[PDB]
Write a protein that binds this ligand. Structure first.
Ligand code: EFF
Ligand code: ZN
Ligand code: ZN
Length: 229
């Protein structure tokens, strides 16, 4: 099922949704997979997260050209770490409009990232302010609160059973919450549960560092974060 395309992997999740996977060596972790999404919305394509590097991100765009052959209207990136924003320059070189949490754009320079062109802001309840996410189509963007990072955001795909937790959510058999160096241990558990409650009918939970899982990924991630506070 999985399509190897250069050094990346692509997996169809639904008629209009694919997971992109790219890898980077991290001493002490091995070659770490990071997952994002590609969504076809009618005559255009929407991307969630870059790959780790510009070169890998250009390869995502090459795959889109070969397998979908429609323009990429925008990309939204889910926090200011390299696995999610490392390929911003490749998107900009391709003329793609890019979006991130305002706080991700604020943090990007100190994190070694290039900021997105546009900043999303969020209501007190976590839902994106709609005027900051124009033309997002089926992408429903939700800020669950600080957790994996202060800026992490999540995305549901209307018309599917899919919600993307990014690096906030780990799989239902995961053993650790991963990189906690920028995390908010006090609010993580609540933020994970807020993601689940924002997308209550999503039965396929996509995440950055594990293959797609059931909603038990949310309950398990929350149950592990419950131990952090
Ligand atoms: C660069 C990314 C940003 S989230 C990172 O810190 N990682 C990769 C995932 C790894 C894991 N197994 O969770 C933890 C270390
Ligand atoms: Zn991260
Ligand atoms: Zn990550």
């Amino acid at each position: 099922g999985d399509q190897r395309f250069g050094d990346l992997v692509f997996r169809q999740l639904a008629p209009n949704v694919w997971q992109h996977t790219s890898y980077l060596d991290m001493p002490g972790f091995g070659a770490v997979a990071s997952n994002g999404l590609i969504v076809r919305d009618g005559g255009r394509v929407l991307v969630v997260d870059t790959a780790w590097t510009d070169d890998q991100t250009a390869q995502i765009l090459n795959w889109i050209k070969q397998e979908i052959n429609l323009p990429v209207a925008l990309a939204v990136v889910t926090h200011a770490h390299q696995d999610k924003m490392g390929g911003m320059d490749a998107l900009h070189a391709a003329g793609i409009a890019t979006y991130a949490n305002a706080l991700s754009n604020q943090l990007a320079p100190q994190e070694g990232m290039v900021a997105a062109q546009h900043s999303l802001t969020f209501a007190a309840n976590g839902w994106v302010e709609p005027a900051t996410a124009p033309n997002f189509g089926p992408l429903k963007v939700f800020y669950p609160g600080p957790g994996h990072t202060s800026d992490n955001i999540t995305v549901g795909i209307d018309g599917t059973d899919i919600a993307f937790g990014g690096c906030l959510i780990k799989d239902s058999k995961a053993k650790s919450l991963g990189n906690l160096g920028d995390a908010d241990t006090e609010h993580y558990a609540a933020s994970a549960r807020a993601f689940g409650a924002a997308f209550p009918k999503a039965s396929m939970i996509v995440m950055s560092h594990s293959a797609p899982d059931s909603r038990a990924a949310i309950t398990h991630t929350a149950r592990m974060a419950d131990k952090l506070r």
